[PDB]
């Protein structure tokens, strides 16, 4: 086997059956998190969407812009039948797990012959003269056909669009300026023009009530948290955690840092969490992760024996504690010899007087003293030839 | 060799498998990912080879110097051609290397003895020419540095440097002279 | 005159799956399509660490004996009180060794991304003990202890011998002993003072290693063209069927950073190995005996040398 | 080295009896987790049936393996299926 | 210098030709391939 015993680990790592005396390496120890603290502010509001095929929208030239704040979301659920639902930059089916930031639902109506014209990096008259999407967009495009209302018996004449515009359109900017556009020279076409909505023609002639639901994540202290209730609060364990959508893993202790009330978190040198503000207790905490350690295995040589003493490198703890770390399975003695199996910080294990594994401070050799005098000398009398 | 079978994120690890199970217009991506991975693995291998070759070059130049200063002559560099005093050397061949046989002189057995810098004969301070003064308790003797070969302090075993006073530790002993016995 | 030589860098270590990936599984799986890579990396770093241990073991272990200073300090007037260890010190390091140790001088965060550090095999007390043994052997036996068994000899006579090996007849030393002792003592005073207020060769090593490790740590903060530099964030925001490509780009970047770091570490390890080989040869030729190579044991005609420990 | 299903060495496995000669008869419905190992000490080919599936209630396609008719059907079993020859 | 005429899987070995024929939001991929290979060339050089 590869992992039942340290001997199995050594044999599987070295791909051999007779392991020689020394120290060898295996995987590293990981402290698993015992539980997970769930934290979220108590947000009671539910965002309005039945009003956002309710009765009537605006057209695309002057498109309805709306704000969302301090309410909860739910995508499983007052609503409209949906032909399409698509979320860029984020999983549409994982949304309720987050605490969003600055949620904006962009509402208008548009013909069914130009459903595909709206996307981050599209071109053509619609997406250049009426609406415009940034190329680093993050949000959802929600579309559904609306022929129940906006295609009259004699045709619809309530919605307009711009044909050709001298200037382009900024991302997220509205065009509400109507003027006779100078196609050529000889200063003065009218922009706003009725569409062809009649239920008498193919589905593309129908309007599609489309709401562009853009949003941000974890940019500012966020309060658009999803339907997940918080849990209780435990400290001083290797735990998981989450805060306003953020996830993580570590040990949550007390804090000593002062903050300003327009920030959320604290980042260290490597750009990762250092301190956190709770969303309910509104207090400050410190993060010290629990994933640490190095594993080392000592053997006297499989030829001799099979009892092995495992070493743990950066772990506070026959369980002997050393500067080299947590050593388990070794009889610490005061008697010092030459090094047999080097450990670190002047420790060496050996298989000596059944017999077992002993850890000790090494010796530097035999200690003697030279009988120095200012009137004595030692003169050799013999030789040895050493090859 | 093992690096070939890994996928490097591509769906399969054989170009024939890719080209068969997939259309080239949609398999160029798999081909390119595999090519990039194999190139970078080869780059790592070549860099390892370069560094190993540099280390081996250092060892080879050390071996050449050891040969030229241990085999082709004796060397005074303490502990460079053995452990002890060096006499001579013997090279041997070896698979991907060389093996040396250093023949090192080593002294083993030593006595005591009580010593002093100089000898005060007649107000003249006698210092050893190339030897060292020892005392056998009863007399003084001049011997060579590495062997107890005691000899009589004569005037050719010493040289004078003026008066006895300046030197510290100078002992008062006679210095034998050959000439006076021969005069008659 | 003094000479300053690095002998070993700090023993570093890294674990890939803890560095590139981390508290994640799909990252570990996507990396598993390379795993011989990270086995190579950990093998190379382990080789470098054990090489540093062997390197110090080679430079400082020349004596198969441990030599102690005789309690009588009658060395013909030479004041070695500065360089011999002082028992009254809390530690077993002599005055000039301590004054050196003082002139040369975050860790947790680095420990928290796999960059664990290993300790040296020999403790500074053990190293100072070796240097003290070498000093006592040199002072009490001349150079024979490097080529046999230690033989007693008066220090004045040994100095006269070392004069005899440059062309100056013994009577010169035996007549100017007091003057020579005074010059020696004044020189030791001057050197301790001149170091009491540099050591660039021992600090550039530490600074370079710290800068390389810091650069690795900084690397985790870049996107490498992904949507976010946080695997946990991308996992909680995005689904497995599409996040895999961005994850893979992140592995590619971080793996490249590790590869570059390992290559530069190997090169610097080779450089330090060359420097430590030079130091070992200087030890065996200058301390364990007089050398007649010009400008290899000082500046001028050479008489003898004393080694002192230092940080790295 | 391989990466597959294996029995960990020294596994705490279960031992079943059928000794009547005392009045022991139970071969319970064992769930099939990934991989099952079977070491049998017999004298008279005692084991006779091997049924595998999920519900086996004539409401899904079920497997019928015996010692060699192997029928995938939708079988309606009874409370305790066993077999038997007469003497 | 001769590792400038390489394509690295991209269509144009000149950034001018990439930009003057292709839109920024569909040209990052071409830039990405080019930049990766040019950085790799620098890495090989500095190591040597
Ligand atoms: C939410 O409820 C918790 C528990 O009652 C309370 O501690 C917290 O102050 C409340 N408000 C906030 C800020 O979420
Ligand atoms: C509104 O909600 C009800 C049930 O909750 C559902 O039957 C209906 O389809 C939704 N209405 C619209 C117009 O989408
Ligand atoms: C080691 O193995 C050899 C055989 O290869 C054997 O003769 C010797 O006794 C063994 N020593 C032990 C038990 O370590
Ligand atoms: C942890 O370290 C302290 C250091 O003083 C020690 O006393 C203690 O025994 C160690 N063990 C644990 C896990 O408490
Ligand atoms: C010696 O070993 C023992 C354990 O056997 C330990 O308790 C003690 O602290 C060690 N040190 C000395 C010198 O007593
Ligand atoms: C010196 O040692 C050698 C060892 O081979 C021995 O043969 C010889 O007799 C010894 N000589 C003396 C002077 O004791
Ligand atoms: C000889 O005796 C003297 C005086 O006791 C002593 O200093 C010297 O070390 C002895 N030499 C040896 C090695 O026997
Ligand atoms: C000289 O010294 C040696 C060793 O002590 C001794 O055996 C020998 O008898 C001495 N000879 C004289 C002349 O005293
Ligand atoms: C050694 O020093 C002592 C005390 O100063 C002195 O009595 C003795 O004569 C000196 N011996 C020699 C030979 O240097
Ligand atoms: C040698 O003789 C001189 C003059 O009498 C005297 O000063 C000196 O102390 C004597 N030295 C010894 C070692 O007897
Ligand atoms: C050496 O010099 C120091 C400097 O103060 C002095 O303290 C000490 O006594 C001197 N040692 C000897 C042996 O003269
Ligand atoms: C598992 O193994 C132990 C071995 O001591 C045994 O006592 C126990 O009965 C076994 N059964 C279980 C609980 O799986």
Tab-separated table of C-alpha atoms in Angstrom, chain E residues 29-44:
chain	number	residue	atom	x	y	z
E	29	UNK	CA	-6.155	36.864	-27.542
E	30	UNK	CA	-3.687	37.615	-30.417
E	31	UNK	CA	-1.742	40.076	-28.175
E	32	UNK	CA	-1.773	37.403	-25.373
E	33	UNK	CA	-0.219	34.708	-27.640
E	34	UNK	CA	2.430	37.150	-28.982
E	35	UNK	CA	3.346	38.534	-25.492
E	36	UNK	CA	3.592	35.017	-23.920
E	37	UNK	CA	6.082	33.856	-26.589
E	38	UNK	CA	8.166	37.082	-26.499
E	39	UNK	CA	8.434	36.808	-22.665
E	40	UNK	CA	9.469	33.117	-23.095
E	41	UNK	CA	12.234	34.228	-25.539
E	42	UNK	CA	13.481	36.796	-22.948
E	43	UNK	CA	13.409	34.083	-20.208
E	44	UNK	CA	15.533	31.679	-22.327
